[PDB]
Design a protein around this ligand. Sequence first.
Ligand SMILES: *[B]([O])([O])[C]([C][C]([C])[C])[N]C(=O)C1=[C]N([C][C][N]C(=O)C2=C(O[C])C(O[C])=C(O[C])[C]=[C]2)N=N1
Ligand code: NA
Ligand code: NA
Ligand code: NA
Lengths: 227, 203, 245, 236, 230, 213, 204, 229, 196
Amino acid sequence: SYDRAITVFSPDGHLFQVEYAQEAVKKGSTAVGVRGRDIVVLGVEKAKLQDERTVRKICALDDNVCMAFAGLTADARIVINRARVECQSHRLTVEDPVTVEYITRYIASLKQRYTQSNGRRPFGISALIVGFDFDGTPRLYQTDPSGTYHAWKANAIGRGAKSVREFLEKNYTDEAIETDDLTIKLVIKALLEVVKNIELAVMRRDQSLKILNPEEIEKYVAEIEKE
Amino acid sequence: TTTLAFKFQHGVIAAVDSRASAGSYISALRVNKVIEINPYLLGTMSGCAADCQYWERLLAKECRLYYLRNGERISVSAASKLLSNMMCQYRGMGLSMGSMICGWDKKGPGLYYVDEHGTRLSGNMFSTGSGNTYAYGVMDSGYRPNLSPEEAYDLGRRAIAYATHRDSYSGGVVNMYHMKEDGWVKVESTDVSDLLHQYREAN
Amino acid sequence: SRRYDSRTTIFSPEGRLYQVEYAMEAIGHAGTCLGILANDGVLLAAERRNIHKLLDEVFFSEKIYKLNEDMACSVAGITSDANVLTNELRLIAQRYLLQYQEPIPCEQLVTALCDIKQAYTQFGGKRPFGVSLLYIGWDKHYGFQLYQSDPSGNYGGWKATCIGNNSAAAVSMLKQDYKEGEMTLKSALALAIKVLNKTMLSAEKVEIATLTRENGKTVIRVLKQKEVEQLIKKHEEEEAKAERE
Amino acid sequence: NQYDNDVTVWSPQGRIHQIEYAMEAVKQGSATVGLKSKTHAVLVALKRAQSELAAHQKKILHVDNHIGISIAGLTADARLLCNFMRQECLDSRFVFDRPLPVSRLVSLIGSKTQIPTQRYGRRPYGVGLLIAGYDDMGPHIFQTCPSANYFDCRAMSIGARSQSARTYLERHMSEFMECNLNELVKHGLRALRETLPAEQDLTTKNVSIGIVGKDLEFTIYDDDDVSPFLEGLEER
Amino acid sequence: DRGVNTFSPEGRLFQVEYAIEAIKLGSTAIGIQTSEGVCLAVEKRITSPLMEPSSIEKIVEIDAHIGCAMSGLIADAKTLIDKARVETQNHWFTYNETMTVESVTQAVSNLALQFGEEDADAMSRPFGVALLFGGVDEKGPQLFHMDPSGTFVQCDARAIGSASEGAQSSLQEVYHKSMTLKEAIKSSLIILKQVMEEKLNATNIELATVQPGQNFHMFTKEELEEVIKD
Amino acid sequence: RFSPYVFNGGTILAIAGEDFAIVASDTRLSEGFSIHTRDSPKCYKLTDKTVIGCSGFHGDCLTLTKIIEARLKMYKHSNNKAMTTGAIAAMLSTILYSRRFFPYYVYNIIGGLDEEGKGAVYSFDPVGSYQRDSFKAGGSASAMLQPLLDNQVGFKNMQNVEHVPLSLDRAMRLVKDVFISAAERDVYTGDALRICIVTKEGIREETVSLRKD
Amino acid sequence: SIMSYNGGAVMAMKGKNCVAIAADRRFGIQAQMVTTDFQKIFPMGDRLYIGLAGLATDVQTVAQRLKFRLNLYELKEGRQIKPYTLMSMVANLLYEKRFGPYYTEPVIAGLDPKTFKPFICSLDLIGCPMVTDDFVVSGTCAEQMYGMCESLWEPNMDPDHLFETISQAMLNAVDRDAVSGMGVIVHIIEKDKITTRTLKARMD
Amino acid sequence: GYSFSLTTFSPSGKLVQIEYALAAVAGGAPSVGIKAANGVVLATEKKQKSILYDERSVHKVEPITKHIGLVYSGMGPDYRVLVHRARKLAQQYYLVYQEPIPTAQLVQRVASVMQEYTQSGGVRPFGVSLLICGWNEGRPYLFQSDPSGAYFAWKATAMGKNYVNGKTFLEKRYNEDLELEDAIHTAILTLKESFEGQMTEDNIEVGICNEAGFRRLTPTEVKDYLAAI
Amino acid sequence: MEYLIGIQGPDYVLVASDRVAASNIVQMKDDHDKMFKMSEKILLLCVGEAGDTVQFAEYIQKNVQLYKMRNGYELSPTAAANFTRRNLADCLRSRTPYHVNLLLAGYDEHEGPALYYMDYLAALAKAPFAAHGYGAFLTLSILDRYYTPTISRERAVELLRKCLEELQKRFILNLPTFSVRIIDKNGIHDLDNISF
Ligand SMILES: *[B]([O])([O])[C]([C][C]([C])[C])[N]C(=O)C1=[C]N([C][C][N]C(=O)C2=C(O[C])C(O[C])=C(O[C])[C]=[C]2)N=N1
Ligand code: NA
Ligand code: NA
Ligand code: NA
């Protein structure tokens, strides 16, 4: 087997292969995540001749935890599958389900091991993992190709994620949080900065994941334009 | 060996005898058959002493390692599951191990019978070891869900004492703990034969 | 050793995989392979690059491969790499069937090969498989399906799509003429020959197959040269009839 | 230059530059001295502090009751190669119930450290050792290097400015064999501060001593432990 | 292009050299050893108010009597923190006792040059992380530094990061060996406030201490807001 | 067929005082109905404050002593200090349990000084279950000595008897008289009596004679 | 015995331009019958069926693992498998477990898809082929099946005559075996058609 | 060893070592294969540098099993690896299935091996195109397999030096129901286009495949076909 | 020692397990549940050696749940049953053979209701009704007597009652209470535990 050192330090102390993996994230479709009290939401940027279902970038990992991604879509699918495996494997080992922190730590740990083990280039993705814990607190974390992870109130990754995060930093008030409708409107406003061309899904307290179809999405497009 | 455990209104009692026995000879009169994993988690012991000691110390290692990683104390369900998985990986190897994992977590008061085979049962009342059957008799007869703390201690103390009376391979001292919302408290390390002499003189 | 290493499994400075892109350029030279979904079926129509007087014609196809009872695929790229990948697809289909005793769903079979193709881009120091595949199939969950994949290990579901020589020109031509929800296999067969007329028209140079469901069982069949040649003359007459008026 | 990066690549000069580069890890590393009498073997080490707030670097390590070492180079290779010596000593005490001959231990270091100099994608051990020890053949000082060469010694020094130490030792060779313990330690200390400039000299913080012989096991002396030995001669 | 286990002409490994260069990019952290306890302080370097401040754990509990502060590649550190955490409980299992601060630091120092290409299962590169261990064992309160080379040493006071050079000068003047713990805590936050291009507050930093009597304690918003004064 | 164990016998004993720790043994090594040797004491010195008694199969005793000796160094090399008496007893459990499925047939009794200065005895079974004790007998005459130690050291089945702690004078005399009684009634106990006494000053060894038949 | 745990009975037979294959429908565990419609004969093509007696888990496993390899063959080759080839594929499959074998004794019966000439064979548990021009048996009532088959079989029988022969051979054999019966099923393989029938057999 | 591909994609998008291996084939001693109605022919140039070479010793036209045969253009040592491997693959089919291996299926298996060396670690591909004759159901089979691991079923083709001239020569002069008498004569005429010297029984080699399997033709059998040219 | 029973209907599947968790001579739990939710429309009922049942059942459960998460749709009862068979068949000739007897009851939307049977050997059999344990020797003939293919669910519970009442009358083991569940179009439905 291949024992070559793929990821190494540079003259100025940079891990160039991890830095080039983060350039692969910044080309991928603009993914955005937002937290609330009762509800947690994810949304993604977008040909006429495609099945929307197959190129979906919002993926459930367990009954309580899902995620979005931005970057290389093939690289994403392996991290999602191995996350899905670890979610059920966690229940098999300790019965109780996975907290959003544990699965994020695992995805981070997996991403980090590819930046340091021989033969392997890093995963060219950043993820936005969301859900509800054992006690029922809502969560939103973010991983990146280096394998660092941090909790967020809201965050963006992908094309023009500076201009979306700049927008989110201002707009994330307690007024937008209160209701389930208002948190969803905030995600659409944020995506309308960079962007029928919006994928969008939600997670409530005890309930599972729920993708909103383009008919349901265009309802909230009317409710934004009034204001 | 004789161990017992039961839930009631004011948390969970956990009482064990102290006799160790290589054959008919008494290896040791006073062995501690409860492990203290943390302030909110105990573990009773029966069967092979070395298996009991090693594998429940390894549970404790992983419970301690869970606290450092996650920044929160382990649940009673997860701890009981983790020990049964250790027993599942060593199935068919002649391990003899008959623990009950008692604790308190977010889910409430918790009690789990875990076994050498891989068995793992959530329940209100349990008993293990050779004196198993004799403990159940006294425990079940005098049980209520709404015992007082003192009446609960009287039940657990008597049940181990009358078990050691009949079972040859149980004896020495009753070691009774009491689980609460604010962690366990050691109730007593009472001598069994002094209790059996006391109950004889009451008639 | 370190001097001789090509290093196929690394990010270039831009943030992308050179051997993956360079493999997709190999596909852009290879023959025009397309696929079109319909209400009553699915089709694949490919440019036949093995074209000489002295070629024998042993097999029932040239670029088209059956995979399961309810599934098939065609390719574009290095044909030797396709023979490896198609053999592995067939193995996956039976590995599922041995396990569950149902046919493998179409998306699951495509993800299984695409997880393997992605491995050749991420680790092992090996060059990727220089093949894009177009898959067709039926399953009990989603029914009539068309999928595309490429050397990266990335896939997508399509209503109609193309790969090979004049890929982009064919897709934009399909974006005009395809009507979603309203297309039958007869209307789809007309559009397949319309697009191949643009990109490449004798029937030796064309190779068509149709997956359909007749009486609770999937029916995969290559068209014979009598069926193709009559469909070519129907295009030539329909093209000429509009030209006069 | 073409012949600089891999240990397998012979130069046209008939040299392996990755060995000779690994030798420079010892030289830029701090100074240490070793010497022996008829009855004892002593190691003396100038402990380099990082900043003046931080405590001084541990330069003399314990291997067995009968062997100990002083180091100069990369500390991870020092500790790795220390544990190899500790283990081979432990094997000999386990297997034979008898301490491992020092020359035989030193031969196993040479055999071990040579292996990666001949193999691709591997490197030499970036560390030189002075190895004090007593056995059936009396006391010994042995030297080892990144090149896998080893030397039996009357005395030696290695590290930063260690040419000064070697010049001192080469004068007083016939004196060492006749010396008592206190005179032998004092000789090693005078060799060490010759490496230093005239501005700075030996204190209890920046000096460590390691002693083994016929009477004594490999004891290490660091702080107030050292104070007896220094208080004798201190000028120039 | 060259191998990971390649010496420079100066006599040192390029990847170790470049791993020290990576710590300069990392955010600054200070630890001061005192007779009454070891304090440990670090800047979070929060890039956005949307980012949750409590989920940047740059000081962490190794055991009830030991902590560790980090600078550099945050992901690289979590591998080493877990291995230390495993090592302490493996030691508790086998020996029924606590490890020394030196013994823990040595165990982590053994992993520093465990990288290479040929002859491997294993790491390709070193860990680009400096660690400031700080705890209280049987030999009083001890603070220990570690770098990517594997070199580890006891420190009366030390810092690591972008303004390691700047902060060490301030530690030289401020440090006194017979001082109290509360003086040493306030010394750090003074020395941190200067070097940070962001402004010091309870959400923007982590502090933590270990005494002989008291366990490892990481400071809360309320406990940081009380000290903030100076 | 091939049997990897054999019973060599001998008795061991340890007592924990307030300021001391006795660890004693006989010197007979047997096999079948013959005596191998009369000078094979079962006491082994580990550290200045810790000694171990080992009885049963002698092949495992030699190996297990050599393992402990090897591990003591490995700890001291890692941690720069000697192992505490409690830490040796904890380590021994893991070594005995590592051979759970092919036992070290060795009854171990460690005795010495804890970190608080006082006496500390740790008794074992072959697969590594242990506990701290005041006193414990082991090996061939375990059954003979233990209930007398329960009586005289534990004050069991006695009333109107003040529970006075053991003087080192009294404990040494007790160890002589019990091993005299074992030597009479046990075939595998005899020849001579090694007694190691662990105080803060160090270890010192006596050798009283026993029955040579 | 191992084969008799689930029991069962399988038979195949030759006629003029046709072959028959048949088996009992009992799945049981020792004394207890469990179900009365358990499949022991499996299709391996249009004019080619395989019958599997003995241990029921291995009956199902060998059927499934043979179908795995069959489907790979048919896709690779681009044809229906020849009967003699399927025998060798089973022989290879079973002999791969030579020292840990599948407890089943297969019986193959089919027409050659080019010539349409009759073919039958059976194999032992370790995959030793046995081709005959008359009949083959496998099950707990092998002795009973042999005695019927040997007496009742004639050469060059038409499809209707073959059915009556093989059915009466099965029915009377399984009626003298405790762990075989609960129905019979019979497939008459001809060139034009496959005629599957289930008999009014004893249910005790 | 080396665990990385030596064959890789260039910016144009071509596997350069395969096209460089095809240059090694294209500059090899020429070889011809023709499919008659009743049989198959394989012929090639065996013109060694001197009369010192023992002509009976080593063969270009080699059998694989009793019903399949083989010939090449390009690298001789590389060819011998493929012969040994193909021979094994034939027996591995016969052991399992107890049937003579189909010619299509032998080519597919050897193609997979030829593909293996265009990707796997530390190895160049083969500098060989194979021509594989056979007889399966009751009819002839001829296949090419070239360094890529791609295979093509041919009625007739040429390889090596003047393969372009041999292919065009064959295209017009081949009929789709030739007799095997005539096809053997055609194969020698295809070689005589590209030849440099007077032809003999020694300096060329021919094998044939029909109803009774594959064999190499004897020198005297070749000498009869050379008499009427 | 333990006892399972399944009764397939036209558009449903009734199932029931006992609730004794036994140990040596003692009935440790009267409220134990032996049914495992694979899918919304599938139950795996499992009985056998003490540690083997739960470890096997849960391994299957999580892989069925993994199939849901991976693909966005659950396994069919046919697929789930052959998956259960494939794992138990591969373990059979290995170091760790699971001694488990089990019923897989389910409902497909296309194929309708299905009850599957499996012994520790891993022979899979689809059945209109079946049962495991020593109780099956008493109760299977009662199902032969009164079962018809068109049996209504409310009648099927009264049939179940006759089997469970026969265990109280004739079976030497206690088995006082029983879990009861129905599967149909609308997934799994809990029912009152048949106590005595
Ligand atoms: B308790 O289960 O009595 C007790 C509990 C411990 C935590 C101290 N365990 C022991 O006393 C004990 C004894 N041994 C080793 C000796 N083995 C046996 O006693 C033994 C016996 O003998 C009675 C038997 O019966 C013949 C069996 O087989 C059933 C197994 C073990 N280890 N722990
Ligand atoms: Na005696
Ligand atoms: Na019968
Ligand atoms: Na019957």
